[PDB]
Every structure is written in structure tokens, then in C-alpha cells.
Design a binder for this molecule. Structure first.
Ligand SMILES: [Zn+2]
Lengths: 83, 29, 86
């Protein structure tokens, strides 16, 4: 009865230790994961800037194709009026 | 004490066990 | 004496193991939360790369169109100057 308890106590002591080492390992993982997660806002803002640069570029390019067409028609209509 | 059924994985543990043999959770958790 | 005292220590240990498991459980839950955030990193990086390449295709095409627009503008301006004269 008594040496059973003593040996149960000893297992509980080793289990305390093995749980605390798991906790310590989980804590140091959260540390390195915090670094990785702190890159995220920057990567988000990067994606945002390229998106904005791409959308402004596309829009400026579609405008310019329409202006080119427009100038070409004016060059031709100004010729007709020339003659 | 008597054998005890882990409340998380349902494994029947020995009376002396402090942690569940299978999921390792403490007896009283 | 010895029996109830050991039993007291054991109960104390067993209750402390619950408090330890409780912190483990909370840490594991936060680690699930973290893993999801970290999993966006390659998606955000792929997304930036995509928009960067599309930006660069558009910038290249738009540069090639200013060149010809300015040339059309100059020819139109010069033709307008002749018609206004005569
Ligand atoms: Zn279990």
C-alpha cells in the first residue's frame, strides 16, 4: 500500500517535469512563430501596393489606347477638312 | 482507487496511473 | 501519519498536473490560431508576385504607347498649324 503510493508519487513528479518541458517547448515555438507572423502585415501591404500599381497602370493603358485611336481619327478628319 | 476511464479518449487506465496511457492527459483533467 | 501525508502530496501533484494540462491546452489552441496566420504567408507572397508581373506587363505596354501618342500629337499639332495658316 505504502510503497505503491511512493511509486505513484514518483510518477507524478516525473509527469510534472515532462509536462513542464512540453510547456517550455510550446513557449519557444510561439516565440519563433511570433517572428514569422510579424512579417505578415508587410507582405499584405506589399501585395496591396502592387495591386494598386497594377490597377492604375491598366487604367492608364486603356485610356491611352482610346486617346491614340482618338488622335488618329482627328488627324484623318483634319485632312478631309484640309482638302 | 480502482481503474479509471480517461474522460478525453475513453481508455481504461490502471488505478496507479497518473496520466492516461494513451493520450497522456492527467487523471483529474 | 505517513499514509495520509503521502496521499496529500499525491493529490497536490495530481491537481498541479491539471493546471499544467490547462496551460498546455491553451498554448496548443494559440498554436492552431498561429499556424493559420502563418499559412497565409506563401499566399500573400504569391499574390504579390502575380500583381507585380501584371503591373510590369502593363507598364511595358503603356511605355510603348506614350511614344506613339506623342508622335500622333506632334503630327496633329503640325497639321493644325498649316490649316490655320492657309
Ligand atoms: Zn486518454
Amino acid at each position: 500500500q505504502l510503497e505503491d503510493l511512493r511509486q505513484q508519487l514518483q510518477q507524478a513528479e516525473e509527469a510534472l517535469v515532462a509536462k513542464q518541458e512540453l510547456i517550455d517547448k510550446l513557449k519557444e515555438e510561439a516565440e519563433q512563430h511570433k517572428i514569422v507572423m510579424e512579417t505578415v502585415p508587410v507582405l499584405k501591404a506589399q501585395a496591396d501596393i502592387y495591386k494598386a500599381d497594377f490597377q492604375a497602370e491598366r487604367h492608364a493603358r486603356e485610356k491611352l489606347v482610346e486617346k491614340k485611336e482618338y488622335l488618329q481619327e482627328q488627324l484623318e478628319q483634319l485632312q478631309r477638312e484640309f482638302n | 482507487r480502482g481503474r479509471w476511464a480517461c474522460q478525453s479518449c475513453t481508455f481504461e487506465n490502471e488505478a496507479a496511473a497518473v496520466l492516461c496511457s494513451i493520450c497522456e492527459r492527467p487523471r483529474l483533467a
